[PDB]
Amino acid sequence: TRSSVLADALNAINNAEKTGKRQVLIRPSSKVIIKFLQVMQKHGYIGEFEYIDDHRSGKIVVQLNGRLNKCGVISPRFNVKIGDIEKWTANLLPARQFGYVILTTSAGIMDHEEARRKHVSGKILGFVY
Amino acid sequence: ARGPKKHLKRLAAPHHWLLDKLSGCYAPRPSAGPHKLRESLPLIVFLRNRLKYALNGREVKAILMQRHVKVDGKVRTDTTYPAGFMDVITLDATNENFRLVYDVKGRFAVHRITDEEASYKLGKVKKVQLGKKGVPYVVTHDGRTIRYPDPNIKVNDTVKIDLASGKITDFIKFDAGKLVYVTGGRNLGRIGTIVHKERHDGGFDLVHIKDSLDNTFVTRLNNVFVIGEQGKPYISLPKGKGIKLSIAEERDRRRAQQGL
């Protein structure tokens, strides 16, 4: 059955970017997905997007500009400590210059550089570049 | 082991003795006495390694067998006698006095003392109790047992002891906002003022201390020692004043004490 939802969401986003499209329809939605896409939208790998209610669990329509190369999830959400970030940014990013491994800390979900600046850690969801 | 040990190998020495690891093969195992094995300082190390008075081991024996060295007013004749913290070492023929105070790096250092300061000695009360025929007594950090204290003296109180008679002169009770030296652990050798007392019943208590430069650190209650008030220590403090410095500050001070 359908076990992860952020994984399916980034699957659909990445497939539509590979085909070169402009929008996606994600079903269902989650709070985690919304926060993740806000992290994307802050650096601007996507444009604006939109929630849709159907009283069950929402759908999302995303406008995607051209800027996403690849996004993905790390499906067992590993526990990470502070120096451990320097492992994963050595694994997943394409350079030291850009790319965002994103974490789920107790102070919210955000990219790794903010968790360097806020000096927190937590678990890991995925990577965007 | 089939009984109590009698040796101490040179690598198993406490690291705060600064013994070299290729002089010989052993270290002087300190005897039983007023201080713990791990945190003592035997007389052979203090004569040879720090004051440079004796070159050999048997020169220590030759000096101590002429009754020059007094530890807290009494003459000791032991090579490995455990002189420890707050203790007074007196050299009559040299006319010198020393108080064993930790340096900021956590080892005992040489520390000159006037004759008036050499008369007394502080001590953390480690247990108060009611002994036979109902007489109260205190037991201090060095093992001194004093009968008939002030009833206001509770555990952890620092007591001033005049070395001539060995009586309680006066004391300090363990209150917040007092001047405190730190006895064990990582933060050893620092001088600060306690912020408050954190209390964990059934376990270990903790103490927040704040130094002269407003750095804050945390030790257990065992490692605490009270000295005096804000700017009023009962003893004379060593140089550096128990102020923990970062390595860059120390490096800049070292090259700032170099101007030809």
Binding site: F78 | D201, G202
Partner: protein, 140 residues
Amino acid sequence: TVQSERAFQKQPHIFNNPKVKTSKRTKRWYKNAGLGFKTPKTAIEGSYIDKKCPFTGLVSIRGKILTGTVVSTKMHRTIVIRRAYLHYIPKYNRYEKRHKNVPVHVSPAFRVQVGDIVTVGQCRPISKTVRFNVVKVSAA
């Protein structure tokens, strides 16, 4: 039934004067175990006698304060709790389930059933396998 044994069951050194008749037929001793653990009512007002009670016995409580979950109560005045946890293998960077059982003495001032969550505390060695004693009960 209190006097179930071949010997008389009494607390030690606790004496009731036959001359001065009290209202209660026994003057009875109890104590608190500390760490803010409240003594139960049936320890004070009950009629049982227990050497190994933490409230009416010669047994203090100090050391490890643990919790767990009851598995068996098939045996007299002691139970077996089962505390489980996660052990971390670092190569695969993940976890596995692992449990251990603990035999633990329970005072008859407690009624405890299989499935209950019990807080216990360390005492001195009570038997071959027991080093703990029931100090608080939370019902499932």
